[PDB]
mmCIF file of all heavy atoms in Angstrom:
data_model
loop_
_atom_site.group_PDB
_atom_site.id
_atom_site.type_symbol
_atom_site.label_atom_id
_atom_site.label_comp_id
_atom_site.label_asym_id
_atom_site.label_seq_id
_atom_site.Cartn_x
_atom_site.Cartn_y
_atom_site.Cartn_z
ATOM 1 N N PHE E 9 109.034 78.952 121.261
ATOM 2 C CA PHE E 9 109.361 79.245 119.890
ATOM 3 C C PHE E 9 109.826 80.682 119.828
ATOM 4 O O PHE E 9 109.689 81.421 120.772
ATOM 5 C CB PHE E 9 108.123 79.080 118.970
ATOM 6 C CG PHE E 9 107.573 77.686 118.755
ATOM 7 C CD1 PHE E 9 106.202 77.454 118.750
ATOM 8 C CD2 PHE E 9 108.424 76.603 118.523
ATOM 9 C CE1 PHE E 9 105.694 76.191 118.426
ATOM 10 C CE2 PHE E 9 107.909 75.321 118.283
ATOM 11 C CZ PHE E 9 106.550 75.130 118.207
ATOM 12 N N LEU E 10 110.336 81.069 118.699
ATOM 13 C CA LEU E 10 110.688 82.436 118.411
ATOM 14 C C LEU E 10 109.565 82.967 117.515
ATOM 15 O O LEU E 10 109.152 82.296 116.576
ATOM 16 C CB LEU E 10 112.026 82.451 117.673
ATOM 17 C CG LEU E 10 112.977 83.572 118.034
ATOM 18 C CD1 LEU E 10 113.412 83.476 119.498
ATOM 19 C CD2 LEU E 10 114.198 83.538 117.118
ATOM 20 N N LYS E 11 109.019 84.133 117.847
ATOM 21 C CA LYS E 11 107.913 84.784 117.129
ATOM 22 C C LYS E 11 108.403 86.067 116.478
ATOM 23 O O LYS E 11 108.963 86.917 117.153
ATOM 24 C CB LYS E 11 106.797 85.148 118.123
ATOM 25 C CG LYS E 11 105.473 85.545 117.464
ATOM 26 C CD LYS E 11 104.581 86.308 118.431
ATOM 27 C CE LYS E 11 104.782 87.796 118.300
ATOM 28 N NZ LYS E 11 103.610 88.544 118.814
ATOM 29 N N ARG E 12 108.137 86.234 115.181
ATOM 30 C CA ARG E 12 108.471 87.461 114.481
ATOM 31 C C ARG E 12 107.335 88.429 114.758
ATOM 32 O O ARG E 12 106.154 88.041 114.682
ATOM 33 C CB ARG E 12 108.642 87.218 112.952
ATOM 34 C CG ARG E 12 109.273 88.408 112.208
ATOM 35 C CD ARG E 12 108.440 88.805 110.994
ATOM 36 N NE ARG E 12 109.148 88.448 109.773
ATOM 37 C CZ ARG E 12 108.685 88.564 108.532
ATOM 38 N NH1 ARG E 12 107.478 89.070 108.305
ATOM 39 N NH2 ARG E 12 109.436 88.199 107.504
ATOM 40 N N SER E 13 107.695 89.679 115.092
ATOM 41 C CA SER E 13 106.745 90.767 115.364
ATOM 42 C C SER E 13 105.916 91.094 114.105
ATOM 43 O O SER E 13 106.443 91.021 112.994
ATOM 44 C CB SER E 13 107.456 92.004 115.916
ATOM 45 O OG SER E 13 108.372 92.528 114.966
ATOM 46 N N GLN E 14 104.645 91.455 114.299
ATOM 47 C CA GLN E 14 103.733 91.715 113.153
ATOM 48 C C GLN E 14 103.498 93.213 112.934
ATOM 49 O O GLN E 14 103.882 93.712 111.863
ATOM 50 C CB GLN E 14 102.389 91.011 113.368
ATOM 51 C CG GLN E 14 102.389 89.538 112.983
ATOM 52 C CD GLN E 14 101.058 88.869 113.222
ATOM 53 O OE1 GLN E 14 100.358 89.153 114.188
ATOM 54 N NE2 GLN E 14 100.699 87.956 112.336
ATOM 55 N N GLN E 15 102.938 93.926 113.914
ATOM 56 C CA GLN E 15 102.692 95.380 113.705
ATOM 57 C C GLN E 15 103.633 96.231 114.568
ATOM 58 O O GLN E 15 103.154 97.245 115.106
ATOM 59 C CB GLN E 15 101.235 95.746 114.004
ATOM 60 C CG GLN E 15 100.234 95.193 112.998
ATOM 61 C CD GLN E 15 99.651 93.873 113.441
ATOM 62 O OE1 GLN E 15 99.694 93.519 114.617
ATOM 63 N NE2 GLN E 15 99.091 93.135 112.496
ATOM 64 N N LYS E 16 104.910 95.855 114.699
ATOM 65 C CA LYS E 16 105.809 96.679 115.553
ATOM 66 C C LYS E 16 105.886 98.080 114.943
ATOM 67 O O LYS E 16 105.684 99.060 115.683
ATOM 68 C CB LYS E 16 107.204 96.052 115.617
ATOM 69 C CG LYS E 16 108.285 96.931 116.233
ATOM 70 C CD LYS E 16 109.570 96.185 116.528
ATOM 71 C CE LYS E 16 110.618 97.040 117.210
ATOM 72 N NZ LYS E 16 111.855 96.274 117.487
ATOM 73 N N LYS E 17 106.123 98.143 113.630
ATOM 74 C CA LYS E 17 106.130 99.407 112.845
ATOM 75 C C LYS E 17 105.976 99.037 111.369
ATOM 76 O O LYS E 17 106.367 97.914 111.007
ATOM 77 C CB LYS E 17 107.379 100.256 113.096
ATOM 78 C CG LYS E 17 107.163 101.541 113.884
ATOM 79 C CD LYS E 17 107.740 101.502 115.281
ATOM 80 C CE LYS E 17 107.681 102.838 115.987
ATOM 81 N NZ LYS E 17 108.349 102.787 117.310
ATOM 82 N N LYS E 18 105.423 99.937 110.555
ATOM 83 C CA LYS E 18 105.228 99.607 109.120
ATOM 84 C C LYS E 18 106.572 99.431 108.396
ATOM 85 O O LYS E 18 106.700 98.441 107.653
ATOM 86 C CB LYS E 18 104.291 100.625 108.463
ATOM 87 C CG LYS E 18 102.814 100.352 108.711
ATOM 88 C CD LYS E 18 102.454 98.903 108.450
ATOM 89 C CE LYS E 18 101.345 98.378 109.338
ATOM 90 N NZ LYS E 18 101.149 96.918 109.168
ATOM 91 N N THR E 19 107.547 100.314 108.643
ATOM 92 C CA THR E 19 108.841 100.214 107.911
ATOM 93 C C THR E 19 110.027 99.897 108.833
ATOM 94 O O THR E 19 111.124 99.677 108.291
ATOM 95 C CB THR E 19 109.108 101.478 107.085
ATOM 96 O OG1 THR E 19 108.835 102.615 107.904
ATOM 97 C CG2 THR E 19 108.268 101.547 105.829
ATOM 98 N N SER E 20 109.828 99.831 110.153
ATOM 99 C CA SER E 20 110.980 99.569 111.059
ATOM 100 C C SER E 20 111.442 98.109 110.976
ATOM 101 O O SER E 20 110.646 97.250 110.548
ATOM 102 C CB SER E 20 110.700 99.981 112.481
ATOM 103 O OG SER E 20 110.354 101.356 112.553
ATOM 104 N N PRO E 21 112.698 97.801 111.369
ATOM 105 C CA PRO E 21 113.231 96.435 111.314
ATOM 106 C C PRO E 21 112.400 95.425 112.119
ATOM 107 O O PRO E 21 111.884 95.784 113.156
ATOM 108 C CB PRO E 21 114.624 96.565 111.945
ATOM 109 C CG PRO E 21 114.990 98.013 111.734
ATOM 110 C CD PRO E 21 113.681 98.758 111.878
ATOM 111 N N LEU E 22 112.317 94.190 111.617
ATOM 112 C CA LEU E 22 111.566 93.109 112.255
ATOM 113 C C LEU E 22 112.231 92.591 113.540
ATOM 114 O O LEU E 22 113.420 92.263 113.558
ATOM 115 C CB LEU E 22 111.289 91.952 111.269
ATOM 116 C CG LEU E 22 110.549 92.315 109.965
ATOM 117 C CD1 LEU E 22 110.924 91.372 108.844
ATOM 118 C CD2 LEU E 22 109.028 92.381 110.162
ATOM 119 N N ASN E 23 111.448 92.548 114.613
ATOM 120 C CA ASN E 23 111.840 92.059 115.931
ATOM 121 C C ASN E 23 111.420 90.587 116.026
ATOM 122 O O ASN E 23 110.400 90.203 115.462
ATOM 123 C CB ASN E 23 111.091 92.865 117.013
ATOM 124 C CG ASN E 23 111.775 93.034 118.343
ATOM 125 O OD1 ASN E 23 113.000 92.943 118.479
ATOM 126 N ND2 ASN E 23 110.985 93.375 119.349
ATOM 127 N N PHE E 24 112.209 89.780 116.752
ATOM 128 C CA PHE E 24 111.969 88.361 117.047
ATOM 129 C C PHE E 24 111.904 88.200 118.558
ATOM 130 O O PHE E 24 112.773 88.686 119.266
ATOM 131 C CB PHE E 24 113.037 87.469 116.425
ATOM 132 C CG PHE E 24 112.965 87.431 114.924
ATOM 133 C CD1 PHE E 24 113.563 88.430 114.152
ATOM 134 C CD2 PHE E 24 112.339 86.378 114.273
ATOM 135 C CE1 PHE E 24 113.478 88.406 112.757
ATOM 136 C CE2 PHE E 24 112.282 86.342 112.878
ATOM 137 C CZ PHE E 24 112.835 87.364 112.129
ATOM 138 N N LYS E 25 110.829 87.587 119.057
ATOM 139 C CA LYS E 25 110.556 87.454 120.492
ATOM 140 C C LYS E 25 110.377 85.989 120.918
ATOM 141 O O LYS E 25 109.576 85.261 120.329
ATOM 142 C CB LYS E 25 109.292 88.279 120.858
ATOM 143 C CG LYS E 25 109.276 89.708 120.304
ATOM 144 C CD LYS E 25 107.965 90.419 120.553
ATOM 145 C CE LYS E 25 107.953 91.764 119.874
ATOM 146 N NZ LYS E 25 106.754 92.563 120.234
ATOM 147 N N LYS E 26 111.096 85.575 121.959
ATOM 148 C CA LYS E 26 110.986 84.228 122.555
ATOM 149 C C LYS E 26 109.636 84.158 123.278
ATOM 150 O O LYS E 26 109.365 85.000 124.125
ATOM 151 C CB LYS E 26 112.145 83.962 123.532
ATOM 152 C CG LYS E 26 112.764 82.586 123.361
ATOM 153 C CD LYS E 26 114.030 82.410 124.188
ATOM 154 C CE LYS E 26 115.287 82.636 123.374
ATOM 155 N NZ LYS E 26 116.506 82.125 124.068
ATOM 156 N N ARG E 27 108.756 83.230 122.851
ATOM 157 C CA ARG E 27 107.416 83.066 123.407
ATOM 158 C C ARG E 27 107.084 81.608 123.713
ATOM 159 O O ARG E 27 107.423 80.712 122.956
ATOM 160 C CB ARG E 27 106.302 83.625 122.441
ATOM 161 C CG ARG E 27 106.240 85.163 122.185
ATOM 162 C CD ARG E 27 106.089 85.916 123.498
ATOM 163 N NE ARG E 27 106.194 87.362 123.359
ATOM 164 C CZ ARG E 27 107.072 88.127 124.006
ATOM 165 N NH1 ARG E 27 108.008 87.576 124.768
ATOM 166 N NH2 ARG E 27 107.045 89.447 123.865
ATOM 167 N N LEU E 28 106.316 81.387 124.775
ATOM 168 C CA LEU E 28 105.767 80.074 125.086
ATOM 169 C C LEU E 28 104.441 80.029 124.287
ATOM 170 O O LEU E 28 103.602 80.922 124.458
ATOM 171 C CB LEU E 28 105.512 79.964 126.614
ATOM 172 C CG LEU E 28 104.969 78.667 127.241
ATOM 173 C CD1 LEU E 28 103.454 78.609 127.236
ATOM 174 C CD2 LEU E 28 105.619 77.461 126.697
ATOM 175 N N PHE E 29 104.276 79.026 123.391
ATOM 176 C CA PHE E 29 103.080 78.850 122.598
ATOM 177 C C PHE E 29 102.275 77.702 123.158
ATOM 178 O O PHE E 29 102.836 76.653 123.513
ATOM 179 C CB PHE E 29 103.423 78.571 121.103
ATOM 180 C CG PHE E 29 103.710 79.822 120.309
ATOM 181 C CD1 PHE E 29 104.923 80.503 120.458
ATOM 182 C CD2 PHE E 29 102.756 80.344 119.434
ATOM 183 C CE1 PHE E 29 105.180 81.685 119.736
ATOM 184 C CE2 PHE E 29 103.010 81.526 118.726
ATOM 185 C CZ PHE E 29 104.222 82.191 118.886
ATOM 186 N N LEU E 30 100.958 77.919 123.232
ATOM 187 C CA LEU E 30 99.997 76.962 123.715
ATOM 188 C C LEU E 30 98.952 76.692 122.674
ATOM 189 O O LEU E 30 98.393 77.630 122.099
ATOM 190 C CB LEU E 30 99.282 77.490 124.967
ATOM 191 C CG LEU E 30 99.919 77.295 126.295
ATOM 192 C CD1 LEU E 30 98.901 77.603 127.373
ATOM 193 C CD2 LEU E 30 100.299 75.864 126.502
#
Side-chain angles (χ1 to χ4, degrees):
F9 292 138
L10 218 64
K11 193 198 93 158
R12 192 231 251 175
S13 63
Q14 278 179 323
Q15 291 94 19
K16 169 169 183 180
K17 251 109 172 184
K18 279 312 148 187
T19 46
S20 303
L22 304 152
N23 209 23
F24 291 83
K25 312 174 186 187
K26 225 172 262 195
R27 293 303 173 237
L28 182 273
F29 278 75
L30 275 193

